[PDB]
Nucleic acid binder design. Sequence first.
RNA 1: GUGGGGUAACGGCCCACCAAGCCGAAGAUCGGUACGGGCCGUGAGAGCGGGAGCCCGGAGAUGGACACUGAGACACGGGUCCA
RNA 2: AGUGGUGGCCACUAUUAUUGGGCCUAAAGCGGCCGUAGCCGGGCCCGUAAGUCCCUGGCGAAAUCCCACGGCUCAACCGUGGGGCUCGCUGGGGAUACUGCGGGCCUUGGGACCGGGAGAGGCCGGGGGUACCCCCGGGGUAGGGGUGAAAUCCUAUAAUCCCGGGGGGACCGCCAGUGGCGAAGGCGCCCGGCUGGAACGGGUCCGACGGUGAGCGCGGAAGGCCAGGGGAGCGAACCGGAUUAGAUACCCGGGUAGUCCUGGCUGUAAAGGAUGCGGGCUAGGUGUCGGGCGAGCUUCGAGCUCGCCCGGUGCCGUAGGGAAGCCGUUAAGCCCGCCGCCUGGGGAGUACGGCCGCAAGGCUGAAACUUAAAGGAAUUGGCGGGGGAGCACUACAAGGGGUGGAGCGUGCGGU
RNA 3: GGUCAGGUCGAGCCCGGGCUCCGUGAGGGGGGAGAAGUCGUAACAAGGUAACCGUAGGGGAACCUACGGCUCGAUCACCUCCU
Lengths: 291, 298, 155, 129, 143, 35
Amino acid sequence: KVVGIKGSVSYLQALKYLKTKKVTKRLKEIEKLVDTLITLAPYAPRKNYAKISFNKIKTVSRSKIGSPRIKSIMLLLWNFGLLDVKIIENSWYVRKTKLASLLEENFKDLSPSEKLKVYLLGGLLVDTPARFVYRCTLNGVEDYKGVKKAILGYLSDQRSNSLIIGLSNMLESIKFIEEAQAYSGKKEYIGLVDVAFYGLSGLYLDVKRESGKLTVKPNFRELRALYEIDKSVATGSDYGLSISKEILENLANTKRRKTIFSEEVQELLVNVIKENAISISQDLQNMYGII
Amino acid sequence: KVVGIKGSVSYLQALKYLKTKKVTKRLKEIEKLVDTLITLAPYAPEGKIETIRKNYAKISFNKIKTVSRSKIGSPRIKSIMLLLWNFGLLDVKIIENSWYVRKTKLASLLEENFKDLSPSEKLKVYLLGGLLVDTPARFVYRCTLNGVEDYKGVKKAILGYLSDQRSNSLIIGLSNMLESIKFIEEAQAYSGKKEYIGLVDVAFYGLSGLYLDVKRESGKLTVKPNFRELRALYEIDKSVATGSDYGLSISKEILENLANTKRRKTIFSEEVQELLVNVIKENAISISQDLQNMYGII
Amino acid sequence: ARMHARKRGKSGSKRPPRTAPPIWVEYTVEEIENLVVKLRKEGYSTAMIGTILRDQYGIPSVKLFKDPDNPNRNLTITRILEKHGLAPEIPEDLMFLIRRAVNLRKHLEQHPKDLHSMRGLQLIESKIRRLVKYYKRKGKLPKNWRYDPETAKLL
Amino acid sequence: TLLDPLANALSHITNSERVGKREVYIKPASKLIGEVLRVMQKYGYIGEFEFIDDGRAGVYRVQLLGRINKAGAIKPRFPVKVSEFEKWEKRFLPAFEFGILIVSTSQGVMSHKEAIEKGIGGRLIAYVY
Amino acid sequence: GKKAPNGEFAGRKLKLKRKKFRWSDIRYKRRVLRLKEKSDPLEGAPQARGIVLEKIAVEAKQPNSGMRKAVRVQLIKNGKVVTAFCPGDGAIKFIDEHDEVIIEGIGGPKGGSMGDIPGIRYKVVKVNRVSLKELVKGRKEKP
Amino acid sequence: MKRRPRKWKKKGRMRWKWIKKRIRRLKRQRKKERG
RNA sequence: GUGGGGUAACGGCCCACCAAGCCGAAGAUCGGUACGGGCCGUGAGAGCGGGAGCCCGGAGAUGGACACUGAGACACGGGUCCA
RNA sequence: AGUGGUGGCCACUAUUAUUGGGCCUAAAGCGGCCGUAGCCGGGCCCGUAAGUCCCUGGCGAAAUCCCACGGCUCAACCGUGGGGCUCGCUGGGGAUACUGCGGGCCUUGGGACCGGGAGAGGCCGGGGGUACCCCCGGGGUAGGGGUGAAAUCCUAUAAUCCCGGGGGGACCGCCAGUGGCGAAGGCGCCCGGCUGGAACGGGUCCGACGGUGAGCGCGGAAGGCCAGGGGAGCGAACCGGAUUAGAUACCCGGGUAGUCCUGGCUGUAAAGGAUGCGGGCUAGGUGUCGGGCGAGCUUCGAGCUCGCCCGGUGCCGUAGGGAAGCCGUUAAGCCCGCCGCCUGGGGAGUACGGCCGCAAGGCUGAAACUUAAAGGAAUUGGCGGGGGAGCACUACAAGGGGUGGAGCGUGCGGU
RNA sequence: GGUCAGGUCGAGCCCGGGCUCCGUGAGGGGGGAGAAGUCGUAACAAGGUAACCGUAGGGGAACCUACGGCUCGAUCACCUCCU
């Protein structure tokens, strides 16, 4: 009910190093952890799931990793829509989504950092919770209150049906994140919005804790780099959110940012998205849609 | 995330006996458990994750025992707690393996007014009080009035009611019911396998304890009203206009049936009825901000 | 004692088949009345009264003497304590069992983990409840009388 | 827990006999048991017997004459009218009148042959031959 | 311990006990619940009329070796398909494809299989309203 | 799940423990694919 | 329960009101099954199984539903509609 | 003048068992305990007549059934006459033995108190204990370890081994037994506290207060699971070395969960005495355990030997049982009370369904179809990469000759 | 005897839903006899690592291993009952 995690508020903060070529122990640890979960997930092309006994599935890598870290990475994977997760009270279940097994078999031969980055971008492409937070950034959000306003706007258009579940849960999380920050200066717990900010942080953003808050800034060169590809296949609604002129212009007038990956990777990803846009959309509806 | 109870799917089927005066050991445990839970719940408004675990009460179910030296199953306690939260009497938060509970101001008010009253009627007055004020109770009530008979109408009503932004007092709770509906109706509408209780279900219960009868044996939980009492309940709801209609009105088909009925016995005696009326009329705005906190963002 | 321990041990005790009381008893019915009222005045229940009477005073048994107030009944200590208003209300054995019950419940309170005494409690409680049910079938208790740990504490 | 004096008594008698001792001491002595003991003694199946006031329940002392093939107690006290004894006799005897049956009747418990002569049914209690 | 109860006033529970254990046997429960009459392909009929489709020969179970002739038939009554054994010598020669036949049970233990043939529950008696045995003797002529 | 002692005699048979476990694994997978 | 209605006739059979009863673990409720008896087959008998053939009682006239004549009817060989 | 084949029903069948069945080894007693309704219940006195029994009126209609007689030639059938037919009901009179119900008496069963004795009866506080691992200081060179052999591995940045000192976690040796205690799984270091009881001796008390238990309730080995701590050794998985045709093992080197404390769940086992519990009876022989009594011994401690009584624990054993194994007063012999279970073998403890548990799972649970056996005990032989005894020449130890390399005689295979 | 107004009984028809029965129907597993194919050596003599049970993991399979229990266990021998 109170889907929050302790003692790891900075654990994902390490993920910033994904875009840069550096790698630290925690980064490769995260990479192996996500590999373990993503391969552990069943996939049928409460009936197609698997239960995660943390004590059992923490020695699978002879590591003795903390449970809160596993919880956090599970939440991240859900946020980016690669993993279907359900939580019977004090219990977690996992199922592999359509995007997974469309990225896994296709793009297994790259470096761990490459695989992580391509997964996160894939989650960005299509109208996931991640795509919502990204479009929110395009509108110029920088704090949890901005997302509160944005989702409160979005729920009152009657187009939010395809994703209403996700934003409902986000608002629920916010209801106590605000407590954990507004009066509580010591951020004891983490929340969904924080997890969403991370992942993007390791992709194109900057995240700095501020006495409970999660003050966020963009990086316009890489933001433009990903914006071009987003425009390349616009198979995701903007949620009726207006990109502010400031951001759109700042994307212009700069030294052209490189392709963040190899062009063959980008075009092949574009291909697989286009060739499966419908099936992934239906799957996503099942994740978050209502009808 | 999903919220719901396994196994005890019929345990609240005995709540319908409240309408009549049949007495059962199932009910005898039910209401004693209700008021034990009300007892252990404190009223320390406060509320913040740190406030929980400080001014909330931890529940260890194993100690919670019947007066028989024979224990009471956990899922029943879970179901009943969720129910009487759903009717606004408790505030329950679930940190893993430690459920934390606190009294809503309606609690320790209905109790305080009625300390020397019969158990079955005590439980009845708790139910009515919960329904009268702005809770999901009132939502499903007006949904029934509009002529909704199962989860489908509840879902459509939710989608409509969130389409105003006036759905701000009871938004988050309604969303919770939406999620439970989404993950439960499927197995309770397709393949008809009956193993979990949703918030729509338990909501139909209690009302079935008051003025409904619910046929479960359809895969779904399809419910019909009792106009005889419903005239009295419509009267008392309009007697204290302290809970909004949620922009959904009674269909004329229900209204004509309501007018046709004879004068059903008041759900209670008249002195306690007026005592309830004027105490609820008292502290109207305070309970409004309390339900705003519990089920609303601001 | 077989009914729970299920051991057929025989530590019972025997009384010879005497119909009339023996001659060597130098006390009479009124004298034993004086002594028994003295004894229960000193704060003893029937078992210890009779033990000491048969021990120091030597009279083998008061059941060998016929009550003057009835020819068909043989005199008993309980009846005598009923004569003067010195019989107890709650029968003695059951009062003892209540006292032991509150004792064990306290020790158990300060010691939860000894499930052996949990079982012992279960046993002594079935014992008291059987005795009470029987006495209800006889009616020497108020019908509304029913065990409660708290009133036992008051006891 | 002792529940039926008579069955224990007759079983005790038979168990003495198959050994063939001389003296038996039925501890559970009752008036009905004594009447019974009179019954077959009137057909000399036993020798003399005596009652002993033990102060508790009486004890019956009995001599055997070594003439009891088997003496059982019909426990479920079947009531029987006069006209059908041959069925119940055949239920508990080896041959025609080869022994007796003890019936409790309105007048007093005693054997069955006379009860046919007096023509009064009753309740079977014991058989012996 | 002693078989119980046996008392004057205990007849009820003794009766209940025996009714409970009356479900322990097989024949009574088979009769009362009428299992055959919902599994029967013959619908309680001693003899049934059928139309034959195919000739099939089988091997005697070991150590008995021998090629037993039989036929598969569709019942005119309901339409199920069942095999009937042909007894005699040279029996199959008389029977041919698409022949009206009359068929009864083999008389095995509990009606089951007999001897050295597996599962075959039936034998023909008349083919085209002419009895098999005399054709086995040859006294009569098949139509 | 009231195991028959007769089945525990290994004559013409596999060890009963393992047949029990095999039935359990089959149970697992069947209930899984059902739901 | 009170007070009436209609009936050949008593009654919740109906109706207006007043009450909260009544049945269920010595198994209601629900389903499966099925006209009941005199009897018959078998057994040394205890018992087991079955109600086709005669007699007695009950129910029906393809299914439903509704009238008239009448002492007697909702009438196999009388009437009306629906399927 | 019928017989044969098939199908269904009673007997066969004590394989449906009240008459009249089994549950140690053949399928069948649940792991243990508590207890509600129900069922079965000590004796004596007074009453009753509800049950129970005897007599008596009405009634249970006919036909069918049993019997004698008459008619049909006899028979079957019919008639006359007598019987009882499920017969269940009902009016009335008498009997009180027992069962029921009411009033009184008694203890023998049971419960209750009191005195010493016994015990791994518990929970709790403290104290230790030997051994092990790690670590530090000293000595010491040149290996240790392990196996059938070795190997992996540790070691010369001083390994193995000895002395000194410190840390840690578990566990409580010999005393230990055919001791003790526990309802059962189970329970052992010393001291102090808290509690539960049992047997023994006294009937001093109560007066059948009972026995069993469908429904209910409780704790309940290992392992597993949820949350937290801890993690010496050992060690699921896993990782190496070795063995092998193959090694997924057995052996060896490591090593995770586990094994420990805290709180909760999970309700399982060859939880087996493969023996559900209570009462009455029944030849004996003998030991220990514990309580009591009486003798003998006494360095005077119920400290040491002998007889008896009671309870627990064996062993042998008469009668007696049982297919036999075997059992046999601690019954699996004979009687009385209650509960559960069983009805050929697989299919199967499965399918569906229900209920429970977070999960793995638990508690209930069929059918089709298929089979002549499955299964139990014991007899003889056989066999053992079982165990003892004894034999030496178709064996071996001591000793001794020589075949196989070359040529030929002769045989067998081969061509 | 026709037309209309009201009350009542009451099949037959349309729409929505639940229930179950029957047939077919892609696809999936296991059950069982057949004789041969083939991987294995699991149990029985200590069946060659004794055997079996409970819980968990692994393995193509018999299985293997982990911990608690058992003689339906053996190899003298064994503490030691009996002798």
